[model samples]
Target: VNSFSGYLKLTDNVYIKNADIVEEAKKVKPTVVVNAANVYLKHGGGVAGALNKATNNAMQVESDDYIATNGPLKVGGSCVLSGHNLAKHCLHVVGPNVNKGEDIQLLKSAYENFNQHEVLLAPLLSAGIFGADPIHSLRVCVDTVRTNVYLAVFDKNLYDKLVSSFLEMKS
Candidate 1:
């Protein structure tokens, strides 16, 4: 029962939405899809886990050698996975386990490193398994990225709330 709540145009090509992230990924067929990961590139749970599952565990195998060479990806750092399913490329960002008001700068920094592309899909980082408030996480994601940013929402109630909040910000 996934539906598009609404979208905010950050730019002509860039838009933010409250919709099913995975479903939206399939619809948009983005140039790149971003995954929220830890330093080790472990897709044990959360969004990373789903992404890993979606890609047939390709992300983990690709990221393993990269992490072995580069060491643990820092909180604000990212790594790329090519030849993946869903998107042409996948960017894994090391998002920290953060609270509502704390370490938001790190989240912003992580997004700041994203390479510009036609379309990019991502979940509300730090909001799910990482335990940050969904609204706060969405705000950080919206404030950081300059290009198209799709904020996937699985829950309809939360999607409505986010749309309402986003509109309030515009008004």
Candidate 2:
């Protein structure tokens, strides 16, 4: 059994299942998608580890055939954020890899600024099992999300398999 200690209950509106996060987002038709993902924040390879495969899967499912890369966002300069570049009316926050609880406050503030009906899909803070224990990692993520923050959990083995499968894809 997995034990996670925190302020929130897992039984409320929170959901546990096997599903792809990005695909889940597409179902909602969100106006602004905030990807609170980072590369080193969690014990895993960060978002790259957990979501790279999922993003690839999404691209495949949607039959998208376009790829674009650009320099990092500008610092303290007058620039027009256009298209999906610095776009969305959407903010993609990639904070430094850190533990839970510490980040939930920031997430809450972001959600508060949005309109009430806008879809808010928040992924587990760090649930990738690249090296850390999967169950415990997931517990921390689920606990930190504020109450009423509808949540989801992928099958425990899903992430572990991603690491192995991708390694094969690479070699």
Error of 2 at 63 (Å): 24
User: Where in model 1 is the C-alpha error above 4 Å?
Assistant: 1-14, 99-102
Please give the range of 10 consecutive residues that has the lowest summed lDDT in model 1.
Answer: 1-10
lDDT of each model, Cα atoms only?
Answer: 0.71, 0.35
The Cα RMSD in angstroms, rounded to one decimal, for candidate 2 relative to the true structure is 12.6
lDDT of 1 by residue, 1-171 (tens): 122346666445446665666666666677777888887888878778887788788778887888788888877788777727677777788766774344656877777756455457777777777677777767776767767666677788887787778678757
For TM-score, the strongest prediction is: 1
Give the lDDT of residue 96 in candidate 2. Answer: 24
Q: Which residue segments of model 2 deviate by more than 4 Å? A: 1-9, 31-36, 39-119, 129-132, 152-171
TM-score of each: 0.82, 0.39
lDDT of 1 at 8: 63
User: By lDDT, who's the top model here?
Assistant: 1
